Amino acid sequence: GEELFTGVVPILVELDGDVNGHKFSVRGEGEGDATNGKLTLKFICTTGKLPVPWPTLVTTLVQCFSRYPDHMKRHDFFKSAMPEGYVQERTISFKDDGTYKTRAEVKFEGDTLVNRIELKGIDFKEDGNILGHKLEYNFNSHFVYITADKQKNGIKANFKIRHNVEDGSVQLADHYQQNTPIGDGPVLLPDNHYLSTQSVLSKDPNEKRDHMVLLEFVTAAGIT
Ligand SMILES: [Mg+2]
Ligand SMILES: [Mg+2]
Ligand SMILES: [Mg+2]
Ligand SMILES: [Mg+2]
Ligand SMILES: [Mg+2]
């Protein structure tokens, strides 16, 4: 799949969500560039006002675009499954609050790398940090710790996302993640390694809808 990730690649993101009964959709459009490890995307709430904070959806809203050092190019599970793609499933547990269960299909449709997601959020506390919109419109940098799954012919990741809250606290969102290939093949099963992740959130001034502009930089490390 590498050759598919030389140069820039256009991206489409689709997310249908339901959190404590509130239903919504998100559409994301942009460009990735795995040589650099760089995404630039604009997501729009296609259905109205987003019932949850934009930052809680960042990890859900294309890890195939991780810049992999040449001395690790063989541990790049994500790229090795293209163009056919992968299923990405997570349990995201917000500390002291609800849980997101997500299922996404990531794959090429022609030229465009597509992310189509269903998200279901349960047990969210009314006027918690999430439903009570107390989270800052920013993001921190994280480590995403990956290991292979012999059995599923795939990988597992595990990381804790730290969301800044308006009172200066930190809402942890614990992430367990499971990826399995779609198409038929053996795929690249990595020894233990991580992704170093960095992200910046911003707004487009001439956009009258509720939206999120995202810049992300990701590179893989942990192997010498
Ligand atoms: Mg949509
Ligand atoms: Mg290198
Ligand atoms: Mg689901
Ligand atoms: Mg309960
Ligand atoms: Mg971290």
Domain locations in the chain as residue ranges: 1-224
Q: Which ligand is nearest to the CA of 13?
A: 1
Q: Which ligand is nearest to the CA of 69?
A: 2
Q: How far is the CA of 134 from the centre of ligand 3 (A)?
A: 25
| Residues in CB range of 187: below 8 A, 6 or more apart | 77, 80, 81, 153, 154, 181
Q: How far is the CA of 44 from the centre of ligand 1 (A)?
A: 8
CA 179 – CA 177 distance, rounded (Å):
7
Q: Determine if residue 186 is left, alpha or beta; phi over 0 gives left, psi from -120 to 50 gives alpha, anything else beta.
A: alpha
Any bridge partners for residue 119, and if so which?
17, 102
Do residues 51 and 204 lie in contact, with contact meaning Cβ atoms separated by under 8 Å? Answer: no
| Helix/strand/coil percentages in the chain, nearest 5 | 10, 50, 40
CATH number of 1-224: 2.40.155.10
The 3-state DSSP class for residue 72 equals: helix
Way it was determined: X-ray
Closest CA to 112 of 224, 12, 216, 215: 12
Q: How many residues does the chain have?
A: 224
Q: Which ligand is nearest to the CA of 100?
A: 3
Q: How far is the CA of 192 from the centre of ligand 1 (A)?
A: 35
Q: How far is the CA of 6 from the centre of ligand 4 (A)?
A: 46
Task: Give me the helices (H) in the chain, please.
Answer: none
Pairing of strands 86-94, 38-45: unpaired
What does the angle CA 115 – CA 189 – CA 218 come to, to the nearest 5 degrees? 50
Q: Which residue has the tokens 């460009």?
A: 31
Please give the single-letter amino acid code of residue 18.
D
Structure-block tokens of residue 63:
């890890």
Q: Which ligand is nearest to the CA of 93?
A: 4
CA 23 – CA 52 distance, rounded (Å):
11
Q: Which ligand is nearest to the CA of 72?
A: 2
CA 44 – CA 152 distance, rounded (Å):
34
Any bridge partners for residue 49, and if so which?
none
Do residues 13 and 213 lie in contact, with contact meaning Cβ atoms separated by under 8 Å? Answer: no
**Would you give the distance in Å from CA 25 to the centre of its chain?**
16
Q: Which residue has the tokens 């934009």?
A: 54
CA 205 – CA 57 distance, rounded (Å):
21
Q: Which ligand is nearest to the CA of 96?
A: 4
